[PDB]
Amino acid sequence: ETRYEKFLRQHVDYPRTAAPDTRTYCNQMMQRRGMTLPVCKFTNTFVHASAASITTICGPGGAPAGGNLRDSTASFALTTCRLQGGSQRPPCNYNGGTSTQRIRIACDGGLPVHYDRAI
């Protein structure tokens, strides 16, 4: 898996996957996307924009933010999932919120490789 593919798998959900509520969205998506084995990932943001929309952050669609970090020009629909309690052992239960925010990602060679935070 390329670092780019890992970024899409972990952080890109577009169009947004339908779910009954955000807790269920998080529970389903964290598992579907490979983030609950072998341990529960503590937190993860899904960005609801295309790979192309996010990739431009690394170039004309974003701005330098120190080191290899870039801030997006655009605000994006986001869902943020945070693990209930503190244990890495499954079962992995999540809570979640949604927002519309600019984002700060790490780029390498013009492509996204990590999600840093919402701005």
From Swiss-Prot:
Q: Which InterPro entries match?
A: RNaseA, RNaseA-like_dom_sf, RNaseA_AS, RNaseA_domain
Q: Could you tell me which cysteines form disulfide bridges?
A: C26-C81, C40-C92, C58-C107
- What EC number(s) is this enzyme filed under? 4.6.1.18
Q: Which reaction does it catalyse?
A: an [RNA] containing cytidine + H2O = an [RNA]-3'-cytidine-3'-phosphate + a 5'-hydroxy-ribonucleotide-3'-[RNA]; an [RNA] containing uridine + H2O = an [RNA]-3'-uridine-3'-phosphate + a 5'-hydroxy-ribonucleotide-3'-[RNA]
Single annotated GO MF: nucleic acid binding
The Gene Ontology CC terms held by the record are: extracellular region
Residues forming the catalytic site = H11, H114
The entry's localization annotation reads: Secreted
Positions with a binding annotation for substrate: K6, R9, K41, F42, T43, N44, T45, R82
Q: Does the keyword Methyltransferase apply?
A: no
Q: Does the record bear Nuclease in its keywords?
A: yes
| Function, in words | Endonuclease that catalyzes the cleavage of RNA on the 3' side of pyrimidine nucleotides. Acts on single-stranded and double-stranded RNA.
PANTHER family in alphabetical order: ANGIOGENIN-RELATED (PTHR11437:SF10), RIBONUCLEASE (PTHR11437)
According to its UniProt record, which protein family does this protein belong to? Belongs to the pancreatic ribonuclease family.
State what protein this is by name. Ribonuclease
Q: Which organism is it from?
A: Chelonia mydas (Green sea-turtle)
